[PDB]
Amino acid sequence: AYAQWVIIIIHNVGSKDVKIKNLKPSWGKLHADGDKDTEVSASKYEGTVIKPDEKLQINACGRSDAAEGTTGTFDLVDPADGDKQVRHFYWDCPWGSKTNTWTVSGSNTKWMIEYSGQNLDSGALGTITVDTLKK
């Protein structure tokens, strides 16, 4: 259902380019900003280079009237280091469960990734701002 939703805002707060790769929704769909009725494909964002002080916004929700939510993964990669993984992200805003998941993993010490705005308890995962900085 549309009630299972997340908005991911990736803001490059550093001075070096970051890139999005392997954007893979596994449940639900991606949609246009402020418009859940307009499906957008992952290819719209796949490989986008986020330059210093730019943002990239991804909107994901459960399919219309479906007893299923939104789940997926993506990577942030370093385009200046042969697309070396920066961090791996996993999101889940499931239908008929009070627990959402937002997991960030990885081991690239040249980067600092901060996130906030998530809601793990009941209803939507919310609007998550992910700030990226290459140290």
Residue numbers in the entry: 2 to 136
Paper quotes:
To gain further insight into the structural conversions in pore formation, we chose pleurotolysin (Ply), a MACPF protein consisting of two components, PlyA and PlyB, from Pleurotus ostreatus. Previous studies have shown that PlyA binds membranes and is required to recruit the pore-forming MACPF protein PlyB to the membrane surface. PlyA and PlyB together form relatively small and regular pores in liposomes. The membrane attack complex/perforin-like family (MACPF) proteins form the largest superfamily of pore-forming proteins identified to date.
The 1.85 Å X-ray crystal structure of PlyA revealed a β-sandwich fold, unexpectedly related to the actinoporin-like family of pore-forming toxins. Previous studies suggest that actinoporin-like proteins interact with membranes via one end of the β-sandwich, with the N-terminal sequence responsible for forming the pore. However, PlyA lacks the proposed actinoporin N-terminal transmembrane region consistent with the observation that PlyA binds membranes, but is unable to form pores on its own. However, in the crystal structure of PlyA, we noted two different V-shaped dimers (termed N-dimer and C-dimer) in the asymmetric unit. Both forms fitted adequately into EM density, placing either the PlyA N-terminus (N-dimer) or C-terminus (C-dimer) in proximity to the membrane surface. We tested the orientation of PlyA by adding a hexahistidine tag to the N-terminus, which abrogated membrane binding of PlyA to red blood cells whereas a C-terminal tag had no effect on binding. Also, mutation of Trp 6 (W6E), located in the PlyA N-dimer interface, reduced membrane binding and led to 100-fold lower pore-forming activity.
